[PDB]
Amino acid sequence: VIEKRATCSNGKTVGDASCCAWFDVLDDIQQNLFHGGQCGAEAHESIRLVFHDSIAISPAMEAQGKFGGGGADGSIMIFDDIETAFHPNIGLDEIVKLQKPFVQKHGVTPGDFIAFAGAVALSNCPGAPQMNFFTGRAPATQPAPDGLVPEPFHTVDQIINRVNDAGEFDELELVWMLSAHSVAAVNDVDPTVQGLPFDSTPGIFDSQFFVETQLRGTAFPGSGGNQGEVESPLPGEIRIQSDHTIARDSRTACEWQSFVNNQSKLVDDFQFIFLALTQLGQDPNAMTDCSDVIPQSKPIPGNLPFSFFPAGKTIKDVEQACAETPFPTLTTLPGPETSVQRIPPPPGA
Numbered sequence: 001v002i003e004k005r006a007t008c009s010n011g012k013t014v015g016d017a018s019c020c021a022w023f024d025v026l027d028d029i030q031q032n033l034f035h036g037g038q039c040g041a042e043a044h045e046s047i048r049l050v051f052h053d054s055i056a057i058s059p060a061m062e063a064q065g066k067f068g069g070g071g072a073d074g075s076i077m078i079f080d081d082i083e084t085a086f087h088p089n090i091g092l093d094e095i096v097k098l099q100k101p102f103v104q105k106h107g108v109t110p111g112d113f114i115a116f117a118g119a120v121a122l123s124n125c126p127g128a129p130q131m132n133f134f135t136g137r138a139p140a141t142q143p144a145p146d147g148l149v150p151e152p153f154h155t156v157d158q159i160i161n162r163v164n165d166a167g168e169f170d171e172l173e174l175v176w177m178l179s180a181h182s183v184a185a186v187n188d189v190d191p192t193v194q195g196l197p198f199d200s201t202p203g204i205f206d207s208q209f210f211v212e213t214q215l216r217g218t219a220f221p222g223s224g225g226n227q228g229e230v231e232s233p234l235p236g237e238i239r240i241q242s243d244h245t246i247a248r249d250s251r252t253a254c255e256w257q258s259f260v261n262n263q264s265k266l267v268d269d270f271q272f273i274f275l276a277l278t279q280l281g282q283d284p285n286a287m288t289d290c291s292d293v294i295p296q297s298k299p300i301p302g303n304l305p306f307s308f309f310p311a312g313k314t315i316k317d318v319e320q321a322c323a324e325t326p327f328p329t330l331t332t333l334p335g336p337e338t339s340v341q342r343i344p345p346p347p348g349a
């Protein structure tokens with residue numbers, strides 16, 4: 001891979017002349033997919049899509065003589081009819097259908113487009129790392145098998161083993177990639193209400209997800225007892241069983257707690273693991289670095305502390321699970337407990 005540093009027609013310099021075409025893709029999706037650069041529903045869905053495209057790869061299966069999926073190869077978009085019907089991928093055909101036209105129009109590979117839209121999406125959320133974007137994913141030729149994407153009702157062991165198989169990720173890295181639930185909502189677990197967020201700041205990439213999953217769950221936000229859902233600590237917020245148990249397991253509880261009040265570790269770890277996900281099934285040395293096309297991320301506005309307890313909660317409500325270090329003493333926002341507002345998805349989610 002020979003790279004040719006170049007100045008694009010917009011006047012910006014990039015690592016390789018082939019990267020210049022992505023500035024037109026960027027302007028199109030910022031206006032027509034993310035409604036003016038928002039960290040809203042489509043941005044969240046695009047971030048989710050990166051993981052469901054990428055994690056569908058299995059060296060264990062390949063060792064048994066069976067196709068195990070191609071990783072970040074755009075298969076979930078190319079074969080959407082097959083893959084979006086898998087239960088772990090519930091609700092993803094909506095975002096795939098919204099993304100499809102941009103791929104056809106710009107003549108980029110589905111896989112590179114999914115990794116691009118995920119990185120741009122995150123750049124729209126205040127607090128996000130400065131994201132990378134590498135090109136080079138050839139179109140998938142076979143859909144991924146089912147049973148590769150984790151479900152919210154899988155055990156901690158099941159999920160640890162799944163991500164270890166897919167990309168040799170350890171239990172620490174599992175925790176890091178779950179940071180993406182800091183900018184996310186749930187549309188399909190509670191059938192009575194769509195758009196319940198995982199943390200109280202679904203438009204900000206912060207550590208509230210790690211704080212709020214550690215509080216005692218006291219109620220369901222909509223209907224009770226749905227598969228993969230557990231009680232949450234705040235009105236309007238949802239908690240799934242996998243996140244709840246990873247936060248409390250002796251292998252991963254101290255790593256989960258380490259992001260509380262530690263913005264630089266959150267950002268650095270997530271930057272790293274997001275890039276790794278987007279390279280599953282690929283040879284990093286055969287890819288082109290087009291990270292200079294991705295916009296600069298913005299800081300979190302205002303002057304509140306980086307991490308805090310939501311109003312109405314104090315250290316007494318934390319279920320301490322990390323045996324090595326006490327949960328940090330955070331401030332509590334003033335006033336009455338307030339409900340987290342839902343994020344309505346586009347039709348079909």
Ligand code: HEM
Nearest residue numbers: 044047048051091150151152177180184185186187188189
């Ligand atoms: C490792 C185990 C994981 C489990 C069990 C899991 C589970 C879930 C579930 C149940 C939902 C709601 C889906 C729906 O209602 O249709 C969700 C949403 C989401 N997940 Fe995960 N997830 C996992 C890891 C990840 C990772 C590594 C990423 C990073 C890209 C991610 C990104 C997201 C995002 C951004 C959303 C919000 C979607 C939206 O707002 O429409 N998740 N996750």
Ligand SMILES: [Ca+2]
Nearest residue numbers: 053071073075
């Ligand atoms: Ca795939």
Ligand SMILES: [Ca+2]
Nearest residue numbers: 182201204206
């Ligand atoms: Ca957040």
